Amino acid sequence: GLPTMNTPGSCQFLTSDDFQSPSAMPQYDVTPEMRIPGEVKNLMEIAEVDSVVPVQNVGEKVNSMEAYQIPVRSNEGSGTQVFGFPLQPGYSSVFSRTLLGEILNYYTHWSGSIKLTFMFCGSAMATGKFLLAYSPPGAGAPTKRVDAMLGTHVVWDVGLQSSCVLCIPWISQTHYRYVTSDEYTAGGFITCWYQTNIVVPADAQSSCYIMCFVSACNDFSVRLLKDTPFISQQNFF
Amino acid sequence: GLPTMNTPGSCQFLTSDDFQSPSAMPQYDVTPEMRIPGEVKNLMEIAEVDSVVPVQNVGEKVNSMEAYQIPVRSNEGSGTQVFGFPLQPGYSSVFSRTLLGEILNYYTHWSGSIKLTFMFCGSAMATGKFLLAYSPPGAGAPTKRVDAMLGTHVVWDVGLQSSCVLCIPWISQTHYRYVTSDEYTAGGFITCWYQTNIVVPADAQSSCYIMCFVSACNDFSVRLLKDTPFISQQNFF
Amino acid sequence: GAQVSTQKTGAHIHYTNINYYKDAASNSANRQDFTQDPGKFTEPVKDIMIKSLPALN
Amino acid sequence: GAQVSTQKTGAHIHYTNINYYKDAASNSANRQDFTQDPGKFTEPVKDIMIKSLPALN
Amino acid sequence: GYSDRARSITLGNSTITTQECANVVVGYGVWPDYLKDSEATAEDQPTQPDVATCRFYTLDSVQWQKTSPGWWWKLPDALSNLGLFGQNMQYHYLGRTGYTVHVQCNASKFHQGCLLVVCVPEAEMGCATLDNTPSSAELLGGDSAKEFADKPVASGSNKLVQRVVYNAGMGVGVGNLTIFPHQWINLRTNNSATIVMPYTNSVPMDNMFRHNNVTLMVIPFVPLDYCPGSTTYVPITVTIAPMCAEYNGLRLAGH
Amino acid sequence: GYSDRARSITLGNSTITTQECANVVVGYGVWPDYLKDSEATAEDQPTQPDVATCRFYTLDSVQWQKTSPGWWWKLPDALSNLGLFGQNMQYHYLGRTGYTVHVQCNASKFHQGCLLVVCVPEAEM
Amino acid sequence: SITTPEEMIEKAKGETAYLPCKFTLSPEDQGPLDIEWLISQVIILYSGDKIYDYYPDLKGRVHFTSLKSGDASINVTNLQDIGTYQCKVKKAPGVANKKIHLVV
Amino acid sequence: RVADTVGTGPTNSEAIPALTAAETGHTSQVVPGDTMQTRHVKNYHSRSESTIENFLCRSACVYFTEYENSGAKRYAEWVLTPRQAAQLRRKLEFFTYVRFDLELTFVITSTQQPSTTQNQDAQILTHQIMYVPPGGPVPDKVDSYVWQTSTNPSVFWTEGNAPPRMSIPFLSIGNAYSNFYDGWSEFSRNGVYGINTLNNMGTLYARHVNAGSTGPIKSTIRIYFKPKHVKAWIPRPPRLCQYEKAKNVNFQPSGVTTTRQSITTMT
């Protein structure tokens, strides 16, 4: 009879504990593993892949394939805004449904860089230049191409290589940010303007589209496992 | 007083656990073992033995020794069917009561080959040839000797050696099969036709019998111990 | 005086065990005893029968 | 026969573990397995694409 | 000194050559090979034609209009009635194979469009009714196009399949379908898309007739557009080539 | 110690076993093999199923009466509609192959008869 | 699992109405079999391997087409009978049911 | 551990890391140092909590049922399936094939039901949980000879102690559990379509060993799954449409995402 003493925390059930337990089927021979292609070892390999972003999620576009498309055209001006949205990868309506955004909805903290790739989907005769800009929080959304230039920007020239990559870096005071909408840990703003104007010849379409893909860099991380707010079960199916 | 902590799963009774317990009769002297012949160390030594198969389990034959016998005779044709049954060693009425089949009824998964031995029990003057065939699942039972030949077959010629062995091999997509009747893991079909015709001289009987024995090969295995559905107890005897 | 043995794992780990009683009928069961010999039930004949040769010549 | 491993600590300790069952499906989970290989999902092409060079030349 | 835009593929007695292409996607980094001796389960010896099956089969073309939702094909079901590949799978019980999907769509500089080519393993699809399940010959099509449909399919007592393009018939976001090996055809640059897929399954071999390993999908994210005068009929063509195919369990023909 | 009267032949997933037989005749002393590289003429690569064709196909039986003259079969024409052998020859233009003919006729000691089994190349009729 | 649980059958009057309830027993399901046909209250009942012929209007009109094999369909006649028929098959581990709507 | 950011400077050259082709799958492997000037920053962040083991290995309720100690409903039964709930199912349906050992936990609680009997002085209740493999005999009633549990694994629990926990080895005839199956069980291709064809996990039975009183009492059991030693293959996109049934992937078409006001709106 070895003398022992029970500490607080006995005979309790923890949703997240790591103990051994007696097997109910002793001396069971499992099937020998075969090599199935494409093994996942971490969730940050599912997040580093591109996913089309629904930027035009306005009105009834969400019930159509039109949501993904960004409409660009030829106008008698310059410096007009194409699109803009905030940098909230888990919470913004724009990113909530993408692979990386859905992965973030299972975590509380996120920290890293963000890649944004744009592919031009117009004619092979149409040409133009765009200004892709990222503005850090402190002063509101830039309302002009001139205010946007003062922030991190990339001038994209459409040619043989249709795609372009704007890499939003980690500028934060803290080490991590909040996936949920918060005001202390604010993200920034991402806007797109016309660096020049869309140039189209005759007998070609002057109304084109762009597509946007979002992924993570090699320095992305997440923490605090939680429950996604998206799924809802009325009753046992 | 060593500080400990009780994990979930304490003070429970498991029908299948492996613990030590204080002996109720301390320092008891057991009788010295003697060598009794025929020791069993595994249940797959009881299964590798031949057992007569009741193929003719039709009508009231089950209440007679007639069930074991397969009737063959002399007919003015050829290619007629002798017998046929599916490959379900644990579930088929044909094998449910044999040694191997009864052993399988205590297990959920089975995986290996199956030996089928046939012994000719006619006169020493009667002669003939038989086609023993096994068809993999995908298309239904073969209805002709010609459809049966396209599957695994053995042409048996009756002579000095009365017995013959058709070895049904393991052709499956999975590693294991289900002892219970299932449609995903289907077995196949085993049929027997007349390769030629039974040849009998005068003053000899033209109506003979065959007998079938079933056993397992050296690669048979079973898993998931369960309760046989055959025994039923109304009350404590 | 503890005994270290191997755990039952799949194909394609060690565990520790100590005996706390002095009775030898208190220990756990012997689950890892994989030894077979079907030459008693199968092939129970006097003259050995080779597979390829005929049974009765 | 006990295994001593490292605890999960911050940056900028050892712990002991013994297996008490003989089943290999009774042990604790494998939480410290930090191995990645995203070259399957990302960059799944035949001809290697250098970063600095053009994609289609 | 050559251009990476030019590629040639030779299989059996067939060849394909491209003037403009992007690259070749090789599945999950795996090139399709044969079944090893430590992974197999069936005992009897496999057959391997090696030339009469592993070649290029060209399915029926489909017109890309200005309002086409998209198309889908089951790779095992599509080559069921084509050449000796169909005959071998008919007689045998177990079949194991890999494929490649070369999709060709050629347009002029003035034409503008975008197509997504993705292979989906175990692409189980849902029915319009919530209680019943999709009927065969409604989900499956022999050498047939099997197009999708913008807007939901009506709910009633009918084994019709839900063909919504935005949910893709699986209930998942159409945009996130880039997790599987995917290639994009951009009329202004890419003309064709090549994808190589290794055999993927939870078992070594499977019955080709009752199970489909992968589903090829072609979805126009950006519509087709042009000006009055340019050619309106713009077709898409698909060629599939089984790779390292082997069969087991020979028996009477049928399914 | 066995008896030369007993023989077994295994091809593909098929087997035949005889209790009484004479011997095996091996054609013109030649065992069938594949086409060499110095004897071939076609350039494109051949297909060789090796298991799905090279097995035993069993044709329809025939009654031997007291007044039967005899029977004849064309070996290429006979296996035209049987198994995968027929399907492969249908799709392809050129086919090269060898065969074996096991003829089975079993009777009792009291029955008396004689049958001649011969293969005739280019048996133009 | 009964195939096509939600189904609607339109049959003309003076023609026998054919209602099909084919099912696939689960390997997990190993219990006594009960097949019950409801008219929305029973027309026929199969229980303990016995068939019982419940509804006065459909008496002598409702009979099974085949049950043990896996087919539990009925063939009604002399339609006048507009209603919903629910085929409920019971196994001790699991249960399933199919509802068929018949017009005229 | 994550990669550390390096330091670059001003650059004027022909190199084009940003410009690329998304026609090819090739996800651009660019880093911020290619499109701006960066400082050297050591990164001690570790990719540890994101591994599949830490993602899936947490207990999660999958089914809760009731039984009584008198009347008609005297025992409970449930075929083993993780698709009864939504939270565990959605997480498992990130992958096509999974292979994991299972840790099972139960939570059994009783409640005295309204009645009019008098002098009710109950005793401690003992509950028996029994598993039947695909093919095992199933109990017709609450006093059936099936409960003898000669070979079926069972567990007995006396109300008041720590919950009962047991560990289950990977049980499958295949080489991996299949979350999604595209095909049929029957070759004729006319029957059950979907994963339902593959599933065969047996049935679970729970009941009161003793009555314990003269008044009615209703017990409830909740089952908790924990995947251990997880392996996973071929990832797939998360479920957008809400679940409808447990046997199939039947869904109702829904919006790709939520809507805002304009395309330039920040909220």
Ligand SMILES: CCCCCCCCCCCCCCCC(=O)O
């Ligand atoms: C009293 C003993 C109880 C023992 C019960 C054991 C039941 C095991 C059930 C395992 C279900 C696993 C299902 C996984 C399905 C999937 O991953 O797709």
